[PDB]
Amino acid sequence: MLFYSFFKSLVGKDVVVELKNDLSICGTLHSVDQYLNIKLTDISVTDPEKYPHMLSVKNCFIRGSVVRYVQLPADEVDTQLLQDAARKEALQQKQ
Amino acid sequence: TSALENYINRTVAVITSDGRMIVGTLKGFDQTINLILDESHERVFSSSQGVEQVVLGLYIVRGDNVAVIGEIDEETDSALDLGNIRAEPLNSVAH
Amino acid sequence: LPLSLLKTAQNHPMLVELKNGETYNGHLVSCDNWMNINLREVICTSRDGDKFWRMPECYIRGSTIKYLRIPDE
Amino acid sequence: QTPSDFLKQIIGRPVVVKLNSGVDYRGVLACLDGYMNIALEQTEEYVNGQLKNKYGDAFIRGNNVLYISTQK
Amino acid sequence: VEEPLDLIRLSLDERIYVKMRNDRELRGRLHAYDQHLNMILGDVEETVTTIEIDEETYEEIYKSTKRNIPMLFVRGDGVVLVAPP
Amino acid sequence: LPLELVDKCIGSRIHIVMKSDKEIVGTLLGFDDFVNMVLEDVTEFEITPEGRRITKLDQILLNGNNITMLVPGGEG
Amino acid sequence: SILDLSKYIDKTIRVKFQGGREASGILKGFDPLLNLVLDGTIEYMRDPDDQYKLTEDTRQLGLVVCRGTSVVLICPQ
């Protein structure tokens, strides 16, 4: 519930999501689900352009099971609120 | 809500867990990532033999294999672009 | 909608390709909500084309199914 | 009841936990849970010899851990 | 009963190193964590280690690549272990 | 029933072979609703190298997520 | 649920698992969670050099129990 809320609070910002097959795609987060699904609008390739798989896709829906790394700016996330939410979730999941 | 209702009855490219892209049209979708598509064709063999690119139609891809699905800006039916075979093969999701 | 299409695919030919590269071409006769398939007259062949054995009935789990090739009809 | 009684009588004893990848972590089992999660300090790593020496508490998830056996 | 998740939550906002699959490591301040081992850490540094093989003598040479990020979230499916540096 | 056989196999020797080329033979101490079981003095042997890996004599909790086969009575 | 094991409660079946290993034998008991208990179990592994000649890498176990969580396919024999 903490990760879905963190994905919902970061909607509308430009971030780069990396897949398990070393593919990275940058775009604006449009929506998120309970299973950490990623939806990127205005999707583009990263700094290497060695993967012309689609090359004409602006909206990409990627599952949460394939995403390995999600790079985000530090100004778009608060450390103390995320730490308090993590400390609450660690007590709520175990009880 | 991150749903695949916007990609129904439109051209879309789905990536498998083995690292293979397939362009088709998702006919129906559900709460699992397993989806039924039509007019499935590869993209790594379209530059060598266009007849061998179209493998089959109306096949169901499982949810454990589908990694990411991106929508294409198809203006009309039977129109596709951006194909190449001189690119590096993508790796698998397992590492 | 994939589950309804699989339930409506009774007595239809199909080819189930597993995650381990094994392929089974048969006629699906029973389906469940967890994508479990029960097919009649299924022939099992490998990824390289080597046929292993033939069975009059076969049961394949949905967790071990990678792809399902159905005809255009 | 019996895995809970086994995990209850294993706190403080030194144990080695082998994961699914084949790496083993040996040390004093400080904390354990019902989902096979382990937290052990001073855990040495053995895959093909000595791989890494830990000076603090090392955490191993239960989803990738294969087995855990007490050292004697 | 001290849980391992409650023990990992006591090391919040401190420098830690997480070893993941495919011979990768990350070092940084763990800002958020959950029960599924998903970690969102600020000021992260990732190191990917590879082994090159010689064509003649077949000797293994260890090489490393390093990258930095201001903030990064990683799922718990790929993370193998966590430790202090 | 498989669960009745697993309950009757407690207290005696049993071998649990995983999905890979690995097995653990020892005295079955107890089991739960999950396939993870407790073993006493379990010896681990790898089949594809065909050799023992570690000989521990204690209470070992083997997770059943990768447990493939369970044979009471040990090997032959 | 969908596949009734009562037709195979006294017949020899072969079950292939997700891990690549396969077993063959006469099933003696079944479970609603796809767990099986069979007597006279012969287990064969999956090797890159042993594809058609799978009779060399075969081991015997007798009375064995296979869990339904790792079962991938079942076939009559």
XYZ file of C-alpha atoms in Angstrom:
573
model
C 0.000 0.000 0.000
C 3.018 2.257 0.506
C 4.469 1.577 -2.953
C 1.115 2.095 -4.704
C 0.653 5.395 -2.854
C 4.203 6.442 -3.776
C 3.468 5.602 -7.415
C 0.173 7.519 -7.309
C 1.753 10.597 -5.701
C 4.437 10.714 -8.427
C 1.927 10.816 -11.301
C 2.523 13.488 -13.923
C 6.307 13.658 -13.491
C 8.985 12.600 -15.967
C 10.846 9.474 -14.818
C 12.890 6.686 -16.397
C 11.763 3.099 -15.767
C 14.259 0.293 -16.418
C 13.218 -3.245 -17.346
C 14.836 -6.558 -16.451
C 16.264 -6.898 -19.986
C 18.409 -3.710 -19.535
C 15.897 -1.565 -21.477
C 15.176 1.894 -20.047
C 12.286 4.129 -21.131
C 11.684 7.708 -20.002
C 8.233 9.262 -19.862
C 5.518 10.811 -17.730
C 3.696 8.539 -15.289
C -0.011 8.447 -16.162
C -1.569 5.802 -13.895
C -0.678 3.013 -11.475
C -2.374 -0.128 -10.165
C -2.192 -2.249 -7.018
C 0.333 -4.601 -8.666
C 2.816 -1.718 -9.307
C 1.899 -1.436 -12.996
C 3.653 1.335 -14.929
C 2.041 3.539 -17.585
C 4.352 5.965 -19.393
C 3.105 8.653 -21.772
C 5.426 10.437 -24.243
C 7.779 7.454 -24.044
C 11.237 7.721 -25.597
C 14.511 5.799 -25.662
C 17.284 6.470 -23.141
C 20.831 7.773 -23.764
C 21.750 4.624 -25.789
C 19.556 4.247 -28.881
C 20.502 0.631 -29.636
C 16.960 -0.758 -29.292
C 14.601 0.220 -32.155
C 11.880 -2.260 -31.115
C 8.861 0.012 -31.582
C 10.304 3.532 -32.175
C 6.797 4.948 -32.808
C 5.117 4.312 -29.431
C 4.136 7.262 -27.239
C 2.150 5.345 -24.592
C 3.651 2.220 -23.026
C 2.154 -0.085 -20.401
C 4.741 -2.195 -18.561
C 4.042 -4.739 -15.828
C 5.575 -4.397 -12.379
C 7.187 -7.838 -12.534
C 9.542 -6.770 -15.355
C 10.596 -3.382 -13.948
C 13.888 -3.601 -12.044
C 14.946 0.022 -11.455
C 12.908 3.239 -11.403
C 14.964 6.436 -11.428
C 13.303 9.529 -9.957
C 14.464 13.026 -8.990
C 15.082 13.780 -5.331
C 12.919 16.919 -5.346
C 9.766 14.932 -6.195
C 9.963 12.727 -3.067
C 10.123 13.602 0.639
C 12.445 11.496 2.797
C 10.781 11.930 6.209
C 7.236 11.133 5.045
C 8.470 8.087 3.116
C 10.456 6.925 6.159
C 7.391 7.334 8.396
C 5.254 5.444 5.866
C 7.860 2.664 5.702
C 8.029 2.449 9.507
C 4.229 2.255 9.617
C 4.069 -0.380 6.865
C 6.747 -2.551 8.502
C 4.658 -2.654 11.686
C 1.370 -3.110 9.817
C 2.549 -5.993 7.617
C 3.879 -8.060 10.540
C 1.700 -6.979 13.529
C -6.418 3.224 -12.980
C -3.895 1.622 -15.358
C -6.041 -0.493 -17.690
C -5.546 -1.765 -21.236
C -8.917 -0.510 -22.517
C -7.250 2.212 -24.596
C -5.155 -0.355 -26.505
C -8.089 -2.591 -27.486
C -8.762 -2.999 -31.244
C -5.584 -1.105 -32.141
C -2.048 -1.877 -33.263
C 0.252 -2.671 -30.338
C 3.637 -4.325 -29.828
C 4.012 -6.843 -26.989
C 7.370 -8.022 -25.625
C 7.812 -11.597 -24.427
C 9.883 -12.816 -21.493
C 12.362 -14.450 -23.888
C 13.052 -11.082 -25.522
C 10.920 -11.184 -28.674
C 8.627 -8.420 -29.900
C 5.347 -9.150 -31.682
C 3.067 -6.596 -33.345
C -0.654 -7.308 -33.400
C -4.057 -6.187 -32.175
C -5.287 -7.048 -28.667
C -8.866 -8.244 -29.121
C -9.715 -8.665 -25.433
C -8.184 -7.997 -22.043
C -8.760 -8.899 -18.399
C -7.373 -8.375 -14.879
C -4.480 -10.727 -15.716
C -1.722 -9.817 -18.212
C -2.641 -12.844 -20.362
C -4.304 -11.373 -23.457
C -5.645 -12.635 -26.797
C -4.272 -10.916 -29.902
C -4.767 -11.166 -33.656
C -2.537 -10.635 -36.718
C 0.624 -11.502 -34.795
C 3.902 -10.985 -36.644
C 7.577 -10.709 -35.743
C 9.856 -7.703 -36.266
C 13.305 -9.323 -36.418
C 12.596 -11.245 -39.649
C 10.450 -8.728 -41.559
C 13.483 -7.247 -43.337
C 14.610 -10.649 -44.673
C 11.314 -12.341 -45.631
C 7.978 -10.548 -45.318
C 5.979 -13.737 -45.860
C 7.756 -15.519 -42.998
C 7.189 -12.584 -40.619
C 3.478 -13.304 -40.104
C 3.465 -16.454 -37.978
C -0.183 -16.853 -36.926
C -3.289 -14.979 -35.829
C -5.640 -15.078 -32.809
C -3.236 -16.423 -30.177
C -3.356 -15.977 -26.403
C -0.163 -14.814 -24.674
C 0.197 -15.719 -21.005
C 0.606 -13.210 -18.198
C 3.926 -14.606 -16.985
C 5.493 -14.073 -20.428
C 4.224 -10.596 -21.392
C 6.612 -7.934 -20.096
C 5.523 -4.635 -21.681
C 2.917 -3.592 -24.254
C 3.212 -0.320 -26.166
C 0.514 1.247 -28.328
C 1.336 2.407 -31.861
C -0.116 5.390 -33.726
C -1.769 3.379 -36.484
C -3.622 5.688 -38.871
C -5.384 2.897 -40.768
C -5.455 -0.875 -41.143
C -2.621 -2.822 -42.830
C -0.090 -0.038 -42.241
C 3.108 -0.588 -40.266
C 6.554 0.995 -40.191
C 9.859 1.202 -38.279
C 11.292 -2.262 -38.920
C 14.921 -3.302 -38.808
C 17.010 -6.437 -38.329
C 20.399 -4.733 -37.912
C 19.910 -4.218 -34.159
C 21.205 -6.042 -31.081
C 18.907 -8.822 -29.781
C 17.210 -8.014 -26.481
C 17.979 -10.224 -23.489
C 15.491 -12.140 -21.349
C 13.832 -11.033 -18.121
C 15.585 -13.733 -16.084
C 19.089 -12.903 -14.888
C -12.497 -12.093 -21.945
C -9.448 -14.428 -22.475
C -11.082 -16.844 -20.036
C -14.409 -16.638 -21.887
C -12.591 -17.175 -25.196
C -10.836 -20.213 -23.715
C -14.126 -21.587 -22.361
C -15.758 -21.035 -25.761
C -12.865 -22.887 -27.449
C -14.227 -26.346 -26.545
C -13.634 -29.111 -29.134
C -11.319 -26.770 -31.068
C -7.743 -27.524 -32.183
C -4.922 -25.665 -30.460
C -1.169 -25.699 -29.856
C 0.048 -25.083 -26.295
C 3.714 -24.085 -26.082
C 5.148 -24.337 -22.572
C 7.829 -22.205 -20.926
C 10.318 -25.097 -21.103
C 10.123 -25.220 -24.914
C 7.751 -28.190 -25.015
C 4.853 -27.996 -27.470
C 1.596 -29.965 -27.411
C -0.767 -29.912 -30.397
C -4.232 -31.195 -29.609
C -7.917 -30.422 -29.173
C -8.853 -28.657 -25.931
C -11.917 -30.114 -24.219
C -11.926 -28.620 -20.703
C -10.846 -25.315 -19.174
C -10.805 -23.819 -15.679
C -10.587 -20.370 -14.102
C -6.865 -20.792 -13.311
C -6.053 -21.390 -17.049
C -5.786 -25.166 -16.543
C -6.340 -27.028 -19.806
C -7.452 -30.588 -20.506
C -7.138 -31.688 -24.119
C -7.906 -34.859 -26.065
C -5.569 -36.470 -28.648
C -2.497 -34.327 -27.899
C 0.846 -34.929 -29.622
C 3.947 -33.674 -27.807
C 6.962 -32.362 -29.713
C 10.075 -30.484 -28.635
C 11.223 -27.029 -29.707
C 13.543 -28.493 -32.367
C 10.760 -30.647 -33.843
C 11.519 -33.944 -32.088
C 8.226 -35.637 -31.183
C 8.459 -37.384 -27.809
C 5.207 -39.298 -27.251
C 1.510 -39.335 -28.114
C -1.293 -39.415 -25.551
C -5.072 -39.695 -26.026
C -5.555 -37.220 -23.167
C -3.365 -34.528 -21.630
C -3.547 -32.010 -18.787
C -1.497 -28.794 -18.802
C -1.325 -26.298 -15.945
C -1.841 -22.598 -16.596
C 1.310 -21.603 -14.717
C 3.480 -23.690 -17.077
C 1.777 -22.474 -20.277
C 3.690 -19.809 -22.211
C 1.682 -19.449 -25.431
C -1.523 -20.811 -26.954
C -1.855 -20.824 -30.748
C -5.491 -20.984 -31.899
C -6.680 -20.895 -35.543
C -8.301 -17.881 -37.172
C -11.795 -19.440 -37.111
C 3.012 -25.510 15.095
C 6.172 -27.560 14.588
C 7.943 -25.051 12.251
C 6.912 -22.315 14.700
C 8.336 -24.355 17.588
C 11.488 -24.954 15.531
C 11.902 -21.241 14.791
C 11.166 -20.334 18.416
C 13.958 -22.624 19.668
C 16.502 -21.299 17.135
C 16.944 -17.680 18.258
C 20.514 -16.936 19.308
C 21.998 -20.165 17.943
C 24.474 -19.991 15.042
C 23.078 -21.263 11.741
C 23.888 -21.323 8.028
C 21.209 -20.377 5.491
C 21.546 -21.520 1.875
C 19.625 -19.592 -0.776
C 18.214 -20.733 -4.109
C 21.252 -19.358 -5.966
C 23.614 -21.623 -3.991
C 25.273 -18.994 -1.793
C 25.396 -19.711 1.943
C 25.420 -17.191 4.798
C 26.607 -18.420 8.200
C 26.248 -16.550 11.470
C 24.317 -15.999 14.680
C 20.589 -16.013 13.863
C 19.421 -12.810 15.531
C 15.920 -12.518 14.065
C 13.497 -14.763 12.194
C 9.897 -14.531 10.988
C 7.124 -16.782 9.719
C 7.862 -15.986 6.061
C 11.392 -17.517 6.382
C 13.036 -14.078 6.557
C 16.375 -14.133 8.374
C 18.464 -11.415 10.020
C 21.897 -12.611 11.134
C 24.963 -10.642 12.206
C 28.609 -11.589 11.494
C 27.505 -13.785 8.586
C 30.280 -15.083 6.341
C 29.430 -15.836 2.711
C 30.363 -19.126 1.043
C 29.750 -19.853 -2.637
C 33.186 -20.985 -3.832
C 35.220 -20.194 -0.711
C 35.104 -16.923 1.225
C 33.095 -14.312 -0.687
C 32.151 -11.522 1.743
C 32.572 -10.852 5.462
C 29.732 -8.987 7.172
C 30.378 -6.803 10.220
C 26.720 -5.995 10.946
C 23.249 -7.448 10.628
C 22.649 -9.063 7.234
C 19.115 -9.664 5.949
C 18.074 -12.592 3.743
C 14.571 -12.731 2.270
C 12.472 -15.873 2.604
C 11.446 -15.832 -1.059
C 14.987 -16.633 -2.262
C 16.173 -18.693 0.734
C 16.200 -22.450 0.132
C 17.089 -23.914 3.540
C 18.526 -23.043 6.952
C 20.373 -25.416 9.283
C 21.823 -24.845 12.741
C 25.611 -25.136 12.950
C 27.001 -27.674 15.416
C 9.567 -11.030 18.932
C 11.966 -8.949 16.846
C 11.157 -9.302 13.147
C 13.802 -9.038 10.402
C 11.663 -6.387 8.696
C 11.458 -4.486 11.993
C 15.234 -4.875 12.310
C 15.762 -3.525 8.785
C 13.402 -0.622 9.535
C 15.636 0.399 12.461
C 18.422 1.181 9.959
C 16.304 3.736 8.073
C 17.987 6.807 6.493
C 21.451 5.201 6.926
C 24.007 4.027 4.388
C 23.510 0.389 3.378
C 24.587 -1.896 0.536
C 22.142 -4.281 -1.155
C 23.437 -7.117 -3.336
C 21.032 -8.177 -6.091
C 20.923 -10.720 -8.902
C 23.188 -10.829 -11.994
C 26.237 -9.708 -9.930
C 25.027 -6.199 -9.082
C 25.334 -4.089 -5.942
C 23.800 -0.825 -4.755
C 24.955 1.543 -2.017
C 22.938 4.377 -0.552
C 20.606 5.728 2.107
C 17.533 3.475 2.319
C 14.594 5.882 2.526
C 11.612 3.533 2.168
C 11.117 -0.217 2.452
C 8.168 -2.613 2.570
C 7.440 -6.250 3.377
C 8.143 -7.337 -0.220
C 11.777 -6.056 0.040
C 11.103 -3.173 -2.361
C 13.573 -0.417 -1.530
C 13.385 3.245 -2.535
C 16.761 4.796 -1.724
C 18.100 8.311 -2.247
C 21.641 9.073 -3.491
C 22.178 5.551 -4.801
C 25.330 4.221 -6.461
C 25.101 1.034 -8.519
C 28.029 -1.234 -9.385
C 27.788 -3.974 -12.023
C 30.549 -6.599 -12.014
C 31.375 -8.773 -15.024
C 33.959 -11.438 -15.841
C 35.788 -11.280 -19.173
C 37.340 -14.472 -20.554
C 40.605 -14.548 -22.494
C 40.582 -16.109 -25.954
C 43.962 -17.831 -25.603
C 44.567 -18.670 -21.931
C 40.868 -18.521 -20.827
C 41.745 -16.457 -17.737
C 38.900 -14.671 -15.948
C 39.352 -10.921 -15.433
C 36.933 -9.052 -13.178
C 35.694 -5.692 -14.467
C 33.307 -3.221 -12.866
C 31.059 -0.394 -14.017
C 29.631 2.314 -11.778
C 26.604 4.592 -12.080
C 24.958 7.143 -9.796
C 21.368 8.268 -9.246
C 19.764 10.889 -6.958
C 16.887 8.546 -6.049
C 15.974 5.059 -7.249
C 13.329 2.462 -6.425
C 14.043 -1.255 -6.865
C 11.645 -4.181 -6.540
C 12.321 -6.968 -4.054
C 12.175 -9.689 -6.711
C 15.750 -8.966 -7.817
C 17.343 -8.014 -4.490
C 19.159 -10.911 -2.814
C 20.600 -9.513 0.422
C 21.100 -6.293 2.389
C 23.971 -5.346 4.707
C 25.846 -2.362 6.168
C 29.055 -1.387 4.290
C -3.678 -39.355 0.649
C -0.349 -37.535 0.249
C -0.844 -35.560 3.476
C -1.635 -38.756 5.400
C 1.547 -40.352 4.037
C 3.524 -37.230 4.977
C 2.074 -37.390 8.496
C 2.846 -41.112 8.778
C 6.390 -40.495 7.476
C 7.209 -38.321 10.507
C 9.734 -39.806 12.912
C 11.398 -42.006 10.272
C 13.896 -41.414 7.487
C 12.764 -39.620 4.328
C 14.408 -38.040 1.286
C 13.164 -34.762 -0.208
C 14.454 -34.134 -3.741
C 14.200 -30.589 -5.085
C 13.432 -29.450 -8.628
C 17.147 -29.271 -9.432
C 19.750 -32.013 -8.944
C 19.720 -31.878 -5.149
C 18.213 -33.928 -2.334
C 18.131 -33.919 1.464
C 17.844 -37.218 3.357
C 17.094 -37.239 7.067
C 14.634 -37.893 9.861
C 11.375 -36.011 9.306
C 10.552 -34.026 12.453
C 7.326 -32.288 11.437
C 5.372 -30.454 8.778
C 2.828 -27.663 8.331
C 0.098 -26.676 5.870
C 2.929 -25.266 3.764
C 5.323 -27.779 2.153
C 8.225 -26.480 4.270
C 9.194 -29.217 6.738
C 11.539 -29.732 9.695
C 14.249 -32.390 9.396
C 16.657 -33.836 11.960
C 20.264 -34.569 10.897
C 19.604 -33.901 7.217
C 22.360 -34.713 4.724
C 22.382 -32.827 1.412
C 23.559 -34.609 -1.743
C 23.822 -33.232 -5.274
C 22.960 -35.645 -8.076
C 24.677 -34.046 -11.083
C 28.026 -33.762 -9.259
C 26.904 -36.934 -7.384
C 28.329 -36.070 -3.974
C 27.494 -34.797 -0.518
C 27.660 -31.048 0.090
C 27.297 -30.570 3.866
C 26.707 -32.991 6.744
C 24.822 -31.085 9.443
C 23.189 -32.726 12.455
C 20.510 -30.336 13.708
C 16.944 -29.136 13.098
C 16.814 -27.797 9.539
C 13.741 -26.107 8.067
C 13.529 -26.933 4.352
C 11.322 -24.600 2.331
C 8.794 -26.348 0.112
C 8.692 -23.778 -2.691
C 11.303 -25.819 -4.586
C 10.444 -29.243 -3.109
C 9.626 -31.620 -5.974
C 9.478 -35.172 -4.583
C 9.276 -36.740 -1.119
C 10.075 -40.424 -0.576
C 9.716 -42.006 2.888
C 12.351 -44.547 3.857
C 15.334 -42.761 2.323
C 17.197 -43.805 -0.799
C 18.070 -47.295 -2.027
C -11.960 -29.564 -10.574
C -11.428 -30.108 -14.303
C -9.340 -33.311 -14.451
C -10.582 -36.266 -12.393
C -7.812 -38.588 -11.190
C -10.264 -41.429 -10.441
C -9.718 -42.737 -13.974
C -5.971 -42.814 -13.202
C -6.130 -44.123 -9.609
C -4.975 -47.560 -10.775
C -3.199 -46.710 -14.041
C 0.428 -45.828 -14.682
C 0.973 -42.132 -15.418
C 3.925 -39.883 -16.226
C 4.115 -36.419 -14.650
C 6.531 -33.764 -15.897
C 7.467 -31.012 -13.454
C 8.379 -27.370 -13.977
C 11.978 -27.996 -12.894
C 12.736 -30.228 -15.889
C 12.636 -33.562 -14.056
C 9.910 -36.085 -14.879
C 8.495 -39.069 -12.989
C 6.655 -42.189 -14.144
C 4.772 -44.779 -12.130
C 1.458 -46.193 -10.993
C -0.415 -43.596 -8.944
C -1.850 -44.821 -5.634
C -3.437 -41.680 -4.184
C -4.493 -38.227 -5.295
C -5.395 -34.896 -3.703
C -7.587 -31.906 -4.619
C -4.436 -29.733 -4.560
C -2.927 -31.866 -7.404
C -0.655 -33.750 -4.985
C 0.021 -37.362 -5.945
C 1.396 -40.414 -4.144
C 2.667 -43.117 -6.500
C 4.407 -46.472 -6.092
C 7.223 -47.674 -8.315
C 8.456 -44.206 -9.228
C 11.102 -43.825 -11.943
C 12.592 -40.330 -12.185
C 14.397 -39.027 -15.272
C 16.305 -35.745 -15.530
C 16.690 -33.245 -18.366
C 20.143 -33.163 -19.961
C 21.359 -31.277 -23.066
C 23.062 -34.422 -24.418
C 20.242 -36.813 -23.399
C 17.133 -35.866 -25.393
C 15.979 -39.075 -27.121
C 18.019 -41.521 -24.993
C 16.444 -40.681 -21.633
C 16.800 -44.263 -20.344
C 20.391 -43.826 -19.136
C 19.721 -41.085 -16.555
C 16.896 -42.827 -14.698
C 16.652 -43.472 -10.954
C 14.221 -45.548 -8.900
C 12.390 -44.406 -5.768
C 9.499 -46.818 -5.177
C 6.921 -45.081 -3.000
C 7.171 -41.348 -3.733
C 4.996 -38.254 -3.326
C 4.935 -35.348 -5.787
C 3.504 -31.986 -4.735
C 0.955 -30.177 -6.892
C 2.781 -26.843 -6.709
C 5.640 -28.090 -8.921
C 3.510 -30.243 -11.248
C 3.479 -28.961 -14.825
C 1.902 -31.709 -16.964
C 0.414 -35.187 -16.553
C -0.149 -37.917 -19.135
C -1.369 -41.522 -19.063
C 1.064 -44.328 -19.807
